[PDB]
Amino acid sequence: SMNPPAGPVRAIAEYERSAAVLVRYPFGIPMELIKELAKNDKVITIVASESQKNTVITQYTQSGVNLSNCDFIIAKTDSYWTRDYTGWFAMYDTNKVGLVDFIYNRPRPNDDEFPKYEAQYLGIEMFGMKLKQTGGNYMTDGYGSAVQSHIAYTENSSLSQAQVNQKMKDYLGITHHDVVQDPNGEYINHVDCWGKYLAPNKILIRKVPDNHPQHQALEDMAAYFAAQTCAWGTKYEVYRALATNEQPYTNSLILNNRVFVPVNGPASVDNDALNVYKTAMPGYEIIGVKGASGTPWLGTDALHARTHEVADKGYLYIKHYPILGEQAGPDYKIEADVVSCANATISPVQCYYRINGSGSFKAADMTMESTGHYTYSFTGLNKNDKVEYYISAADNSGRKETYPFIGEPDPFKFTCMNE
Ligand SMILES: NC(=[NH2+])NCCC[C@H](N)C(=O)O
Ligand code: NA
What we know:
The chain is an alpha/beta fold and 419 residues long. It has helices at residues 31-40, 50-62, 82-85, 109-113, 115-122, 151-154, 161-172, 215-226, 267-280; strands spanning 10-11, 18-24, 42-47, 70-74, 88-92, 96-104, 126-133, 139-140, 145-149, 176-180, 195-199, 202-207, 237-242, 253-255, 258-263, 285-290, 308-311, 316-320, 325-327, 333-340, 346-355, 362-365, 367-370, 373-377, 386-395, 400-403, 412-416. Its cofactor is FAD; FMN.
């Protein structure tokens, strides 16, 4: 249809549960990357025909790819930039997952048409947001914020900024459309070449040497996010990836509990960038990925550009705003909504917690106050006790999720003040 999705709407972040990753043949990525992806995750390869599917299968077979995780969509495409032209995922109507199409900002009509085939393959509804856009210039935090470079306005110049924001609100639930002047000074003007949310409370911003002409622009961008309160209420943790030679270190893919980071030398500088991700994202497997010689990584175009995560149409979604830092008390009550997009019975919903850093985490069942709305109150705590906690839910479709996604390795932390 030509109507927007039934609300409420919530755009899905890249670090939420993904059912798959979407890539295209003829390839722009190394076979070793496809192999590593398919070890743990479903890889959907776009091909133009049944014969082309079988050509790809032959190559996957030769390369030892886990075929059990290889799936295909038959559709014409102009390019391998699946980041930029495939559809955007959003929850809508409380418990549904939908796809949002847009006008691809390139003269690539097959790429532009592609989202309809994606929605058909996935069995989800598609909604048409009439803005000139590109996935490389889009990221959301999963809490209603999105960051884009200025082309989101300038390539939609027949609309006011207000009208652009309103389209993002209506189709994606974006209530904070953070559009900023691109700090990189190159043609492409995609956020994925300088910035990346790593979690709702973490953003990676590119850094360059002091004498690079964009040094100050990037420092100003880092400062802007560091001054900003995030969805969870704390200031963003701002991480920096140092590009000494225009390496595309921000152009990474977060797929479930792994992070694929393009690397292109020198080795020490690549390792420094991997180390930033490792520090920022405990519990994640951080993987450096060398480029293919025929389609190498570039400053403006690397791994993120040539992949697109795919949401789970049956997503078991946990909505939670954490209690963090110095908390007054005397009640320490957490609240979470849990929605099963599989329409499955949810049970159990638990708080896993640890007090003062010792032993194992302990499970307590949360109490369902009203439909889909769960709470839990931390009892018996003394002034200055430190709490680590995370939420865990399961449903009878077999799904199991934690909040945060990674769970126990990176729990929410607060301190009981009793004041
Ligand atoms: N998400 C990205 N960084 N995409 C890079 C796209 C590169 C391609 N040459 C273009 O300008 O269309
Ligand atoms: Na499109």
